[PDB]
């Protein structure tokens, strides 16, 4: 039964039902369906006068479920297809899909863009040598409580056509992946699918990913990356396909993410699971008064009911679309468009990848220890999939460079922003506070020739301590970064 309509303090009751002739093989497990049928009674082989009830199905209807068992088949009607083509021809459908995700959540615009990229997904490719590459992206929202990450998980589970919502504490290794159970009558083992089998071709959402057990986290690695679960248990060996896009939410190991604390201490995840994730969105609370007053007004408008009026008016405005239309558009974009890349896009993509790897050199130089947030070749495949999803928004078969720079912007906003989180410093600060006075400026070439060519300090100490004085806001930069000015 529907979880929204369960009675108080009880369990949802499973009821056995039957289909005949062309009503068979119409529903995937996990969908929400309305069924019309007769409520008949049949005698079962298992007290007094107990005859078990069932429902003989006369009719199946489901807007969330489409095309029965999936055959990549176009069953959308012609005027709805023309309306969907009109939506794909819209010049600002990207902002429409961004505003469609979480209308009652202020901020988190890059998270909403990554969610839309997760819902559209990449393109699955097949090579002649059997090389299968991933066509889905996995996004991990790591951050402080009160950032509405779990509400984003719930809204992703609502919008997506195939989606399941799971826990970290309520999970298990045989629960997320497929389990091996025993049939009672035959006494033979059989595989019953888990949460990543019910989400095949769709979205799995994990809440409190930081807390799920260490033996429980690592049964997911082939199901995230290889898109398959290889099970050899109880005399049954098989490789089931699980094409699941993973959306996980987590807090750091410490209670809140601390900017004073090192990023290695906040994350006790292995580097493998962050290599598998594609958007590692680390979110914080900066306590800005404008942001606090804006979120205060927004949540007040949500609680009073005025946000119902604003979203109902803005739907008729045409800048937002509902759950059903966006769900069917996700299904149509996955079933119609699977784009390739232009040759000029590959130069920009490879150049940005070697640029961010060269930046990872600079990130891992001075700390001398390995970063907990790695950028590997799988992250280049991630940016490829982001570009292909950005092409899949507007049914574009060619992923041009305009989509490429937005993909680069999303990756810099998520993963490069996440990865960027003794006597020399104090001696530089004293020498520079005595060297240039309050209200006067110095060129960077003067500091280079007098503090590096003199070998008073290193160049890395200069580059770090200029930023250190910048964030202290007593000495800032002016005139295109070529002047250092003491604000005083």
């Amino acid at each position: 039964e529907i979880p929204e309509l369960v009675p108080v303090g009880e369990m949802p009751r499973n009821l056995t039902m039957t289909c005949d002739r062309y009503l068979t093989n119409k529903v995937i497990p996990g969908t929400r369906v309305t069924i019309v049928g007769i409520y008949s009674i049949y005698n079962s082989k298992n007290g007094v006068a107990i005859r078990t009830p069932y429902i003989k199905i006369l009719g199946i209807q489901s807007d969330v479920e489409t095309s029965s068992i999936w055959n990549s088949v176009t069953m959308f009607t012609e005027e709805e297809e023309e309306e969907f083509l009109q939506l794909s021809r819209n010049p600002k459908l990207y902002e429409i899909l961004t505003n469609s995700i979480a209308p009652s959540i202020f901020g988190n615009e890059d998270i909403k863009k990554a969610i839309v990229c997760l819902l559209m997904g990449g393109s699955k490719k097949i090579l002649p040598d059997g090389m299968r590459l991933r066509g889905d992206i996995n996004v991990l929202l790591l951050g402080d409580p009160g950032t509405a990450k779990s509400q984003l998980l719930k809204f992703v589970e609502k919008v997506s056509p195939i989606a399941v919502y799971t826990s970290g504490k309520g999970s298990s290794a045989a629960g997320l992946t497929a389990s091996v159970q025993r049939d009672p009558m035959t006494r033979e083992f059989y595989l019953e699918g888990g949460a990543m089998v019910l989400a095949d071709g769709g979205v799995v959402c994990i809440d409190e990913f930081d807390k799920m057990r260490d033996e429980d986290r690592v049964a997911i690695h082939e199901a995230m990356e290889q898109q398959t679960i290889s099970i050899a248990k109880a005399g049954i060996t098989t490789v089931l396909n699980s094409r699941t896009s993973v959306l996980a939410a987590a807090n750091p190991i410490y209670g809140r993410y601390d900017d004073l604390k090192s990023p290695g201490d906040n994350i006790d995840f292995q580097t493998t699971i962050l290599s598998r994730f594609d958007m590692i969105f680390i979110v914080k609370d900066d306590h800005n008064e404008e942001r606090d007053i804006s979120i205060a007004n927004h949540v007040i408008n949500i609680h009073t009911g005025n946000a119902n009026a604003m979203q109902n008016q803005q739907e008729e405005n045409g800048s937002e679309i509902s759950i059903e239309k966006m769900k069917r558009y996700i299904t149509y974009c996955r079933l119609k468009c699977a784009p390739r890349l232009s040759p000029q896009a590959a130069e920009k993509l490879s150049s940005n990848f070697v640029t961010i790897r060269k930046q990872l050199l600079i990130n891992e130089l001075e700390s001398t220890e390995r970063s907990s947030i790695p950028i590997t070749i799988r992250q280049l495949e991630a940016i490829i999939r982001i570009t292909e999803s950005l092409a899949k928004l507007e049914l574009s078969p060619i992923a041009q460079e305009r989509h490429v720079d937005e993909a680069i912007r999303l990756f810099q906003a998520s993963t490069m922003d996440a990865a960027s989180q003794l006597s020399e410093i104090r001696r530089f600060e004293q020498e520079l506070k005595r060297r240039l006075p309050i209200g006067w400026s110095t060129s960077y070439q003067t500091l280079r020739r007098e503090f590096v060519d003199t070998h008073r300090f290193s160049q890395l100490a200069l580059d770090k301590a200029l930023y250190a004085l910048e964030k202290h806001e007593t000495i800032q930069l002016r005139h295109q970064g070529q002047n250092i000015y003491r604000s005083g």
Binding site: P145, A148, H287, E289, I293, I300, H303, T304
Partner: protein, 114 residues
């Protein structure tokens, strides 16, 4: 002499307020609570302070709704907002260390007393 209302009446009163009366925030102020939340986020900048999130504004809204539910009034008044803000401010002040309880009490005294 130990309680104004009898317990047998009070339990049924709580059950009837829970299952029948659903208050709603319509004619509320909804600007004083914004300044209260902004000031709570500003004074939650201390290292060992009680954390304030968006959930605490929503907590103020449930405490005001529960205070409106206690009177069996389907609409929330501004007095219920004042009492909810007083409870949340008093909890935040009692959570703070005694070096700054006087400063934190004088900082939010304009919202609770008036």
């Amino acid at each position: 002499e130990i309680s104004p209302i009898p317990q047998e009446l009070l339990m049924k009163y709580i059950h009837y307020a829970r299952t029948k009366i659903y208050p709603k925030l319509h004619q509320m102020d909804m600007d004083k609570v914004s300044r209260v939340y902004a000031d709570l986020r500003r004074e939650s900048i201390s290292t060992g302070s009680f954390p304030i999130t968006v959930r605490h504004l929503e907590s103020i809204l449930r405490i005001a709704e529960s205070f409106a539910k206690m009177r069996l009034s389907e609409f929330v008044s501004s007095y219920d907002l004042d009492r909810a803000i007083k409870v949340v401010v008093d909890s935040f002040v009692d959570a703070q260390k005694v070096s700054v309880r006087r400063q934190l009490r004088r900082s939010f005294a304009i919202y609770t007393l008036g």
